[PDB]
Paper text:
The mutant proteins Y37F, Y37A, T36A, S52A and R46A were crystallized (the latter in two different space groups) and the crystals diffracted X-rays to a resolution of 1.5–2.0 Å. The ΔΔG for R46A is significantly larger (8.5 kJ mol−1), and that for the T36A mutation must be larger still, since we could not measure any DNA binding activity of this mutant protein. Both R46 and T36 of C.Esp1396I are seen in crystal structures of DNA-protein complexes to interact directly with the base pairs involved in sequence recognition, specifically with the G and C bases, respectively, of the C-box recognition sequence GTC. The movement of the Cα of residue R46 between loop conformations I and III is ∼6 Å, resulting in an even larger movement of the R46 side chain. Since R46 is a key residue mediating DNA sequence recognition, this movement allows the recognition of variations on the consensus sequence of the C-box. Both of the R46A crystal structures and the S52A crystal structure have adopted loop conformation III, despite the varying buffer conditions and crystallographic interactions in those three structures. As with the high-resolution wild type structure, the C-terminal tail is also involved in several crystal contacts with multiple monomers in the T36A, Y37F and trigonal R46A structures.
The C-protein binds at various sites within the C/R promoter to regulate transcription of its own gene and the associated endonuclease gene. Unusually, in the RM system Esp1396I, the C-protein also represses the MTase (M) gene by binding to the promoter at the transcriptional start site, denoted OM where the C/R genes and the M gene are transcribed convergently from different promoters. Flexibility in this loop is very important for DNA sequence recognition, as it has been observed in the nucleoprotein structures to adopt different conformations depending on which operator site the protein is bound to.
Numbering used by the authors:
A (entry chain A): 3 to 78
B (entry chain B): 2 to 77
The structure:
């Protein structure tokens, strides 16, 4: 899936840009490290509530996240 | 429901009504249950990214269009 891969990519990109490991983001959001690893491989079951929490943890606003996402969708 | 949650629900229903589609129409076109559509439009907490992909495919709305509308609603 095109959208799933781009969501996964943007979450990994923002996490790596904040210098956070998957563990770091998990600890900040009270999620497991394997949930973050999992979403970066396949974002199918990531919910909007979990994405809001992740965006909170990455200290990215929702608008910037979606701007980043539109950019990735359009690059393709 | 947070404001991101509410706005995702709002934008789905906004586009659905602009498309002249009922909930049942969206359910048919997305291959999701009408109960689930009903629920998302009230509260998007448990909407997954795959279900959002199928909702956009059933509304026949470009993903970029959906996220641009979402950014505009978040900013209002």
């Amino acid at each position: 899936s095109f959208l799933l891969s781009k969501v996964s990519f943007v979450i990994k990109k923002i996490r790596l840009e904040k210098g956070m490991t998957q563990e770091d983001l998990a600890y900040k959001s009270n999620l497991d490290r394997t949930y973050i690893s999992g979403i970066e491989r396949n974002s199918a079951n990531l919910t909007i509530k979990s994405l809001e929490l992740i965006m909170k943890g990455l200290e990215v606003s929702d608008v910037v996240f979606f701007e980043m996402l539109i950019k990735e969708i359009l690059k393709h």
